[PDB]
Amino acid sequence: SFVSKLLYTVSALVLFHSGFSSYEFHHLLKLNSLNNAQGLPKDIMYETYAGLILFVLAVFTSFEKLQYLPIESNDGKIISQGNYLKEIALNKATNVDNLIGSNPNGEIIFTPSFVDVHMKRKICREWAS
Amino acid sequence: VFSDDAFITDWQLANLGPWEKVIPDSRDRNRVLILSNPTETSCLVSSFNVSSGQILFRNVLPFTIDEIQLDSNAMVCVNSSSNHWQKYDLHDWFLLEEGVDNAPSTTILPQSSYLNDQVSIKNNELHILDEQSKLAEWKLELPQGFNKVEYFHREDPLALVLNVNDTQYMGFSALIPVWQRDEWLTNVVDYAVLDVFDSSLWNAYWLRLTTNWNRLINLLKEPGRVFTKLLALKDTTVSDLKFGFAKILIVLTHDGFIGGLDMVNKGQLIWKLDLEIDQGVKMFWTDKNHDELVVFSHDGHYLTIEVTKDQPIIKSRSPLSERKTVDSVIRLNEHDHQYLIKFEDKDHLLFKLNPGKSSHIFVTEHDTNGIYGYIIENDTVKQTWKKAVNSKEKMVAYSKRETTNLNTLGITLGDKSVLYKYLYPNLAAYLIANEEHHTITFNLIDTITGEILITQEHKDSPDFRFPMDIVFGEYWVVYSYFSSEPVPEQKLVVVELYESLTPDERLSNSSDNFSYDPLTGHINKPQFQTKQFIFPEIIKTMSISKTTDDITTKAIVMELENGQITYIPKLLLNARGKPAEEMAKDKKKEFMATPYTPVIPINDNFIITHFRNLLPGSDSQLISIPTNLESTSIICDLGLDVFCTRITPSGQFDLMSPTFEKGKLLITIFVLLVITYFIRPSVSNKKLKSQWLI
Amino acid sequence: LLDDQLKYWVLLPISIVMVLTGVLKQYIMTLITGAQPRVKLTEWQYLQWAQLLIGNGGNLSSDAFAAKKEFLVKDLTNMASFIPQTIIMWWVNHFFAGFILMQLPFPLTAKFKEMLQTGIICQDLDVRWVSSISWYFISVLGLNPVYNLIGLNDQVDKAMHAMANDLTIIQHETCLDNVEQRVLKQYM
Ligand SMILES: [C][C][C][C][C][C][C][C]C(=O)O[C]([C]OC(=O)[C][C][C][C][C][C][C])[C]OP([O])(=O)O[C][C]N([C])([C])[C]
């Protein structure tokens, strides 16, 4: 388990514990007031904010930098942009496409069916067959 | 809504008084007639099953005991001033005959003579003898106390009644004890309520985590897991103790007797203390701590009693400074521990008892002659003013303004304008009944200075022989009297007080920094609106209910002549009402503006004492005790018969229900869960695999 | 006031029912979803081709603008809202009536006391104390983030011939002529 799910589970446990402790403390401020005939803040607060900050850091450490594998090659060669999101300018989007050896137009470029029939008739002849 | 808790919550005790005469019944041989509870004008004639308890019926006859004698049976009762007489059947209270000229006859009820006939007591032991051949069958050891043998029947349904202590009666049969009765509670004068209830930072983190986790671990086992999660499945004692329903009611009888009654468990007696004061007049808590009582006696003594969980102890008895008969006692300011004592002969004594181990004070006394008022200065009392009635007038009803928690400062109208109800604390209301004009006048006196500020007279031939009463609310007054002219029926009248009747005005009550001075007389004066309603039955007395915060409607509660108790919410008694023709599409009226409806019919749902007889005596008190669970308030009737119950004027909205449908809700949730879980694969597979046509 | 452990049996079932009926609504709208001759789809296709050559392909066809038009002209010539909210109001007013459920943390005005406290017949209780229906009145507005987090998602020839005659010289787009300036306007 990496940091994000760890921080989710820890945040859930801490927040439930702080909620139960505040339930107990605020229940015996009215019951105890009634027992007197109508007559633990700091640590609880700090625990609650600790749980909140844990949750926020658990929501933020769920973002991993994008890392790829090349379509053509077979070694690892992780092609990392060092980004968290995807660019909106078409230049950089097609850039991150081109660093991988693929083409998003795909079928229009390769025309898969015709070269498919030609190559699968070809593949019988070659040496690996 | 009633039948679940019909007899469960109602708390009625039957008191027959100390028995004066026990007359056998000629038919149904195990039955007797008991004349008891004498007074100057009436007595209590009851029927009693002698082989059990189980009082059969009771009636308050308006004759003294010496005027009630048998025939020459038929129980002839004859007045002495006139010769009005009534012959009543035994074994059924049928008025067999009535007349004015001559009584048929009488025989004096015979004395017991049970010695020389059937009884001999020598060695602290009671022997029953045959008249002849005194073989002494059925001997019995005497009880600790022993006064006399009340009743004794020797034939086949053998029954014996012993008056064991001064107020206790023991009943034996052929000898084994069969029943036991106690009438120590025959007349309650004053009450008091006793309540029963429960009972660096990293180290804080560790102790809290360890105790919580160990608490979870211990309860982890004992499926039972789902029922522990349910929290539905129960003992009602913790529920009653949590809401404040359970209480101890401390009552002082007319003779000297303090006792504690369990407000739950149908009034089992927790403890009884016997004083020797020979009459009790008042009872107070000595301090806010609610541990000690001070008890005033008729002859002038005062007692200090230590209330404990066990039987109390009478820690002190001593006389007052002046040994005269005590009429009444007023509690002065709590912290100064003062009391003002009014002796008959009308003499006032300031009293400062103990620590319990210009700031003027004003008092107000009322008599049938008028309202008097006093000022307490420098530990002395001084007469301040007087409002005395004429020779032919007589004050009949009087009431003070009860202190009330302030929730809302004004009643708000439709179109969101507010009337700014009149809230001035030092007010009293009273009724003057005048012969020589046959009128009833209502007055709303300002008690610090003595201004009248309202007078309102009715001339509709009031009767003056039927009971009259008044109650004073937060900002309204309601009084009741009988009258003949419109129809011969009981009548209620309600007046409501406002600072000004124009829909948005504070003509006065400048609240910023003014620091009002009431003794000068500078205060603002009220305006009022009044209505009258007709009620079927004669209302003996009235009260208004109390809660922890005075939010729910006040529920004017009435004790009728029958003994039945009925309340009506203050919403029904609406001044400013309209006849329900002018309420339609009147945007200005209110939220949920109730109509006028002058004729009020009796509603059998609200009649508390569903089937209880509840003969409450001539001198009785209606009291209301607040509780938690603010929808509910306790009401009790003290007198000859002591009774207690709970009412909810606005419905029960705090506690959810005893008839909640949990199973239907869980069935709905489970149906939704399974239908989702079954329809999900169908939609997923079908639509996702068909829309892409793979 | 002092309410007594009716928070669970009112707050939790209502929220569960709203979540489950939202999921069911999504699934039912998925399943319900809210030309046959080849010539019909062919003509629709040619109509769409005219539309895209108006909008889509009429931008970078600088040399080919003139050649196309002859070929073109010669070839051419709320139950979803109403059902479930009413059902839920019906169910809530049936099962949960005449109760005080909670107090809101923010002070409303008195007409909200009129709207929200239908169960109770008091007259000065508060504006901040509410019956059960208020919990629905908030849960309708605020359930969007929960739904997001749990995972959920959302005759003919004459007219186009007239536009074909309209589009002849309407706009010949200045593209494939200024592109050197814009390439030299960036990538510096
Ligand atoms: C529907 C969402 C809920 C919004 C409710 C408003 C919450 C904010 C709020 O309490 O302000 C209140 C709302 O008093 C009022 O009720 C008057 C409303 C004023 C805003 C009207 C907007 C056109 C008015 O401010 P205040 O200083 O006069 O009240 C005393 C201070 N306080 C106790 C409030 C801390």
Ligand SMILES: *[C@@H]1O[C@H](CO)[C@@H](O)[C@H](O)[C@H]1NC(C)=O
């Ligand atoms: C009196 O009590 C006895 C025993 O409980 C019973 O047999 C008898 O019927 C009772 N009397 C009446 C009138 O019910």
Ligand SMILES: *[C@@H]1O[C@H](CO)[C@@H](O)[C@H](O)[C@H]1NC(C)=O
């Ligand atoms: C008998 O009648 C007179 C009539 O004035 C009344 O005063 C008296 O009280 C009556 N007797 C009893 C015992 O009440």
Ligand SMILES: *[C@@H]1O[C@H](CO)[C@@H](O)[C@H](O)[C@H]1NC(C)=O
């Ligand atoms: C009468 O007094 C005795 C002795 O104090 C006590 O038992 C009780 O108060 C009375 N007797 C009985 C048998 O109850």
